[PDB]
Design a protein around this ligand. Structure first.
Ligand code: HEM
Ligand code: HEM
Ligand code: 8FD
Ligand code: 8FD
Ligand code: H4B
Ligand code: H4B
Ligand code: ZN
Lengths: 411, 410
């Protein structure tokens, strides 16, 4: 069975066969679409078919399918599973898996870069201190003095689920958020809950509007531990505007390295619960969401005042106006400091090229329109008019519960 | 099975049971979501009865007379008529209820908070294109109401054997012409280039301007369609000027006040109304973001940003975004200045969130297609962006249908 998608701006039609290789479920049915829902201890019983399926993919990709090396590896994995109840990926397989988990990330507009991912194997790590070291080196290598490089660090896989490695931070670098007694919030409202945990765990908060949070790291199921990233490793960018001299006086800055650390990487049935990965920012992530979301820094008001906009009627589109200027200032600041950033126009254009290339050489590209389309100026970006098919392929990155909700506290 | 939707900006959670009354199919499966796909012989006596029963059952419940004499009587009445005549006709009451609920159920429409204040014009006694033209002029004048726009639908006779279809061939009642140039590009409105050609190919004398209102191409009882010119005094237009930039008038821009979609099919109780133009009023972005700035449309973005002397050498200057905002400010300004109804995307999305709440509260849910409900600009600073939505197909409903010129036997 073949399925088609149409770009309605260019009339270009692409044929997806890859969707057939999909096993996992979307959340949708014949009678309901869950396309806009945010989110719609594994035994030896169900593990080898997962293992086999992955190794089949792996050896296909290296043109060794059916080879003696392929079959021997199947047998080796088999025996190791029935013997140890799990199994270990070779380095080659780990690297392939991590790249393809990104390649398959249907909500990610940056996937044109998927094959140049730098994979750091931290599966030998045993302690939080050890984790801190791996993460410091990740941050230093990824940052590259502003010339950002994609990277992922992979900590040991889940065993019995009682010995997980977790990074408790949702990102390696994020700013603290403080709920004040008068109801207002200091810093980043998105991080108030995590910030409180840190403080309870003994973190001494500067209580400023842009405090970098400590790393809260969990090794082998033990209680998590606090570490401070060396400030010289955290590259930041003062936010100013090319035309508005008063914008600097808003006192804003953002960090340069987006590094998501609370997701789970799944490869051939193995579960990697701590796998922080990083690339670089699309401007709108900071300038639209991180600044202008009502539940975030929410500086729309302030910028609109300084621009002397008509904030009386919404139909003055003062919000729209301020949003653009803020995103202008974010791109300007990063480029000025030679820190890698991509605008939403460049990025969506790239993606369409990536998508078309993926449909031809792979037979498809799973894509989530709800997430791919930028949070401003959607229809003047080429993904808006692009029909997309969304399905779930493995290896994949998955959501997982916040560790503080499931963790058994040692003490 | 009883599904929840959460708003991630406000943590409001709604429980959806209405979806369990869904009959039609979405195009998705458990393995694949087709949520971003644009579009993912007559009814027998067999399939027609249950569609009628289902519709009549919900009609008589809506009037709190489920299981009444009237209900069973009307049910048996239609039951009898279908077996005889092989189809059936709706009571006026049922027709109005049906049309209102096709709108209410339009999962892609952000303006549904107005759904029950629809004005239904029964045009089932129409027999000719001339008659269609008359009804359509009356619709237009009533809907326009001197700029105080009013929602309306006009319903022409229902399909019979598919050989006698009433169709309005225009995609909308009022739209501008699109002319292909020997120069290469496109003058007027590019979206409408093929239809403009058909009108000429059917005899229309094109003034070949930039804002030439298209004629109506009306088809009654399955005969060849006929050209008609809408009296210009019934076509309310708004000249587009900017409250800040004087040079904006010189772009020579205007748009019409009345959005009236005319190529969709209305389905009620299994019955098929292939001609049912309906209209309300514009959300600003419908004109300014899409009808002006889409690459496949007026695409005036370049000329606008030029006139603002923005740095157009790199995309990261966001000159497109900056222009796009100004244009939509002007569209809103112009319509408001000339006292023509219009709503901004902040206003409409906020209303839709309110509408959603109402529907979960009094009806147990509201089918909603996030991909189409979020406006084409400034998505995340509008409240629907952070709103989870469930999409499912309820009936009565509006449906897409083939373009008539791919179908019509001359
Ligand atoms: C290098 C440049 C990259 C860019 C510009 C980029 C951009 C984006 C953006 C804009 C989103 C939307 C998420 C949001 O709005 O919150 C996203 C999602 C995502 N990205 Fe990428 N990304 C990049 C690199 C990477 C890398 C290196 C990985 C992992 C190896 C990755 C994995 C993902 C995943 C798994 C999601 C979906 C998360 C979810 O479902 O919530 N990205 N990306
Ligand atoms: C009164 C104010 C109204 C507003 C502000 C409004 C707004 C919109 C918008 C913005 C869309 C998205 C489509 C696009 O961007 O091209 C849409 C779709 C739609 N509207 Fe509404 N609308 C209104 C009235 C009505 C009425 C009176 C009806 C019918 C009785 C209706 C039926 C529909 C339908 C069926 C669609 C989906 C068409 C499709 O599936 O392609 N609308 N509307
Ligand atoms: C603002 N929406 C968020 C609240 C939703 C979200 C949740 C999670 C998780 N868990 C992870 C998420 O990450 C998206 C993502 C992941 C990785 C990225 C990388 C590596 C680079 C980049 N520029 N953006 C990313 C964006 C997002
Ligand atoms: C810009 N995307 C369009 C090209 C896709 C579209 C297709 C069809 C059809 N057939 C019908 C469509 O109509 C949407 C619609 C329908 C009715 C509306 C009413 C009554 C008012 C209004 N302001 N907008 C509407 C918008 C749209
Ligand atoms: C409710 C909705 O599904 C949710 O807010 C999604 C929509 N699309 C998104 N798209 C991106 N890129 N990032 C997001 O966080 C979201 N949030
Ligand atoms: C590709 C995509 O399905 C298509 O362009 C849709 C997306 N969302 C839309 N949303 C609205 N309101 N109107 C549209 O025409 C579209 N087009
Ligand atoms: Zn779906």
């Amino acid at each position: 069975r073949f399925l088609k998608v149409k770009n309605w701006e260019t009339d270009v039609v692409l044929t997806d066969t890859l969707h057939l290789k999909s096993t996992l479920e979307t959340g949708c049915t014949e009678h309901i679409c869950m396309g806009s829902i945010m989110l719609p201890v594994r035994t030896k019983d169900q593990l080898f078919p997962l293992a086999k399926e992955f190794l089949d993919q792996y050896y296909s990709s290296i043109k060794r399918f059916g080879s003696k090396a392929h079959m021997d590896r199947l047998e080796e994995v088999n025996k190791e599973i029935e013997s140890t109840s799990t199994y270990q990926l070779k380095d080659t397989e780990l690297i392939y898996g991590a790249k393809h988990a990104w390649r398959n990330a249907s909500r990610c507009v940056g996937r044109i870069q998927w094959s140049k991912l730098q994979v750091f194997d931290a599966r030998d790590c045993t302690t939080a201190h050890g984790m801190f070291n791996y993460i410091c080196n990740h941050v230093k290598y990824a940052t590259n003095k502003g010339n950002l490089r994609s990277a992922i660090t992979i900590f040991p896989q889940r065993t019995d689920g009682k010995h997980d490695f977790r990074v408790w931070n949702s990102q390696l670098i994020r700013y603290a958020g403080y709920k004040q007694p008068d109801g207002s919030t200091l810093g980043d409202p998105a991080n108030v809950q995590f910030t409180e945990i840190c403080i309870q765990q003994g973190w001494k908060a500067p209580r400023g509007r842009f405090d970098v949070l400590p790393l809260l790291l969990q090794a082998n199921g033990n209680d998590p531990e606090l570490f401070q990233i060396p400030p010289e490793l955290v590259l930041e960018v003062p936010i100013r505007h090319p035309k508005f001299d008063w914008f600097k006086d808003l006192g804003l800055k953002w960090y340069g390295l987006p590094a998501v650390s609370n997701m789970l990487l799944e490869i051939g049935g193995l579960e990697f619960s701590a796998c922080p990965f990083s690339g670089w920012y699309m401007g709108t992530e900071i300038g639209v969401r991180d600044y202008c979301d009502n539940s975030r820094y929410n500086i729309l008001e302030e910028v609109a005042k300084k621009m002397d906009l008509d904030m009386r009627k919404t139909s003055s589109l003062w919000k729209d106006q301020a949003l653009v200027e803020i995103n202008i200032a974010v791109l300007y600041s990063f480029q000025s400091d030679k820190v890698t950033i991509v605008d939403h126009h460049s990025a969506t254009e790239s993606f369409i090229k990536h998508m078309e290339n993926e449909y031809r050489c792979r037979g498809g590209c799973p894509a989530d329109w709800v997430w791919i389309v930028p949070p401003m100026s959607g229809s003047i970006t080429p993904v808006f008019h692009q029909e997309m098919l969304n399905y779930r392929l493995t290896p994949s990155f998955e959501y997982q519960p916040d560790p503080w909700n499931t963790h058994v506290w040692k003490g």
